[PDB]
């Protein structure tokens, strides 16, 4: 039986998000997670932007930690799960992107910090930020 894990969704919750005082360009890595049957990945968020261009934004990235071959091609979608558990503020890679070991792809301006704070009741229940990343692996 020749099989492959072609799709997977990773949910990541960052507690006491308001306590995350990392400055522009500082990052928060999630633990590394694998997809199955080979590939290792992790998420990276910049609470206060990666750079000036994104100073008022939270930056979100998908990193390919390891792959058996030279590269991996994949489509991805990032979103936030709200208080009611529903998806919101979704952004998706239009096409698939070419990942290689140690390289990431994502959105530099995924969502504005002031918006996240203003809607804290809904987007930061108990001051917890829950991120959702759905990936589509098209080539291994």
């Amino acid at each position: 039986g020749s099989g492959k894990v072609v799709k997977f969704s990773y949910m990541w919750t960052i507690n006491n998000f308001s306590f995350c005082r990392e400055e522009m360009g500082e990052v928060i890595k999630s633990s590394t997670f694998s997809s199955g049957a080979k590939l290792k990945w992790c998420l990276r968020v910049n609470p206060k932007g990666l750079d000036e261009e994104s100073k008022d934004y939270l930056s979100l990235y998908l990193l390919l930690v390891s792959c058996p071959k030279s590269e991996v091609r994949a489509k991805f979608k990032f979103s936030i799960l709200n208080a009611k558990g529903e998806e919101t503020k979704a952004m998706e890679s239009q096409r698939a992107y070419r990942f290689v070991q140690g390289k990431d792809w994502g959105f530099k301006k995924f969502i504005r910090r002031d918006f996240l704070l203003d809607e804290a009741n809904g987007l930061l229940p108990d001051d917890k930020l829950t991120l959702f990343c759905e990936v589509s692996v098209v080539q291994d």
Binding site: V27, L50, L63, G102, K103, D104, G106, F107, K108
Partner: peptide, 8 residues
């Protein structure tokens, strides 16, 4: 569009 890398 506007998907970018923070590693590369």
């Amino acid at each position: 569009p506007d998907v970018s890398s923070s590693t590369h």
